[PDB]
Amino acid sequence: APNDPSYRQQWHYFSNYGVKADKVWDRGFTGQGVVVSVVDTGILDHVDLNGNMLPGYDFISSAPKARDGDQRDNNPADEGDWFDNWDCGGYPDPRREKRFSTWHGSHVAGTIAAVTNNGVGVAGVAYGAKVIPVRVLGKCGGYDSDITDGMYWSAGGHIDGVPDNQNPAQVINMSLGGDGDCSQSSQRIIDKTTNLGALIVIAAGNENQDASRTWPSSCNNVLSVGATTPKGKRAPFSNYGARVHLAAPGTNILSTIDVGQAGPVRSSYGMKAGTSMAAPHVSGVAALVISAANSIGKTLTPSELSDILVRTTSRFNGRLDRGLGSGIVDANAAVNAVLGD
């Protein structure tokens, strides 16, 4: 087992209804040579992240929302997405008044590739991989064009005014979205991105509704991930239905955070719930599978990779209350599909 002192708490990696990540590590695959993009709130300066991060980019076009004094820039630092005093609108509704910072991008990035076997904090699913932090979300969320520009750039797509990505990603994690359908424009950019050879893994959403009512789940050519609990049941908030392809642990997920309620204060570790968390488990397992395929000189298309992940899932705990794809992502079974027994 990894020596990270909080690994023992990461049930979602090795326990019942977890992703069996440990069995693949045992086999010698950790996502070596794979680049994974995290399209999210950005990245923290964190001892359990730094070593596994490659250069990213800050696509937030609004300086005030980015909280860094400029528009788009080459520093995807998460400055905090908190707000107070109805800064994001909605006055006088008390429920719209304030939120603490999420450190969402960092929690997600830690699930994919937290520095492992370093005697500190936690482990990551694909800890031999590297992450490019693609910052698209700041105060009050994110702009449509910033998110998709970031996604496209992640795969090696050229964006005017931005230096070209020298670390194109084979897996793009998008733990974001909201209510909506997929426009022909939004579908066009998704298609451009995935047909470069990158798998787009997305969170199904947290509205306890059919995922077809949400973006990017309403889009084609993405891998939509629902959230399961330690009981191997559907997390009550998880979106569901035919547009969800598989599930992964999405409650009680321990990963890398900051303690700061507003700006960064101090690196730490914390539990979070959401389909946003489930998604990085799948992204991590995708990286594991790619590292296994690389070892035998086998090329996998995103279509082939997604097929492997979906067809090799482990069973839910009995029948669920809604459709949530084929089962829970199983790294051991996924790698078995590429290398054999």
Which residues are marked as active site? 40, 104, 276
* Beta carbon nearer to Cl ion, 159 or 310: 159
User: Which residue in the set 68, 81, 146, 149 belongs to the binding site for Ca ion (CB under 5 A)?
Assistant: 68
CA distance 196 to 109: 22
Minimum distance, C-beta of residue 201 to Ca ion, in the bound complex (Å): 23
DSSP string, 12-57: HHHSTTS--HHHHHHHT-S-TT-EEEEEES-B---TTTGGGB---E
Contact mark string toward Cl ion, 138..167, x via CB under 5 A: ----------------------x-------
Annotation-wise, does 38 bind a ligand?
Answer: no
CA distance 232 to 220: 27
Residue 321 binds to Cl ion (criterion: CB under 5 A): no
Task: Please count the other Cβ atoms lying within 10 Å of the Cβ belonging to residue 239.
Answer: 29
* Beta carbon nearer to Cl ion, 111 or 165: 165
* Beta carbon nearer to Ca ion, 121 or 226: 121
- Whose tokens are 């090795």? That residue is 14
Spatial CB neighbours of 84, under 8 Å, sequence gap ≥ 6 = 97, 98
Minimum distance, C-beta of residue 145 to Cl ion, in the bound complex (Å): 16
Minimum distance, C-beta of residue 101 to Ca ion, in the bound complex (Å): 15
Closest CA to 212 of 185, 243, 233: 243
Name the burial class of residue 31, with classes exposed (0-12), middle (13-18) and buried (19+) by CB atoms within 10 angstroms of its CB. Answer: buried
Q: Which residue is nearest to Ca ion (CB)?
A: 58
Minimum distance, C-beta of residue 157 to Cl ion, in the bound complex (Å): 12
Annotation-wise, does 81 bind a ligand?
Answer: no
* Beta carbons of 57 and 134 less than 8 angstroms apart: yes
Residue 229 identity (one-letter amino acid):
T
* Beta carbon nearer to Ca ion, 6 or 252: 6
Tokens of 108: 């997600």
Residue 4 binds to Ca ion (criterion: CB under 5 A): yes
Q: Which residues are annotated as a binding site?
A: 4, 48, 58, 68, 70-71, 73, 75, 115, 118, 120, 122
Q: Which residues are annotated as a binding site for Ca(2+)?
A: 4, 48, 58, 68, 70-71, 73, 75, 115, 118, 120, 122
Give the residues lining the site for Cl ion (CB under 5 A). 160
Give the residues lining the site for Ca ion (CB under 5 A). 4, 48, 58, 66, 68, 70, 73, 75, 115, 118, 121
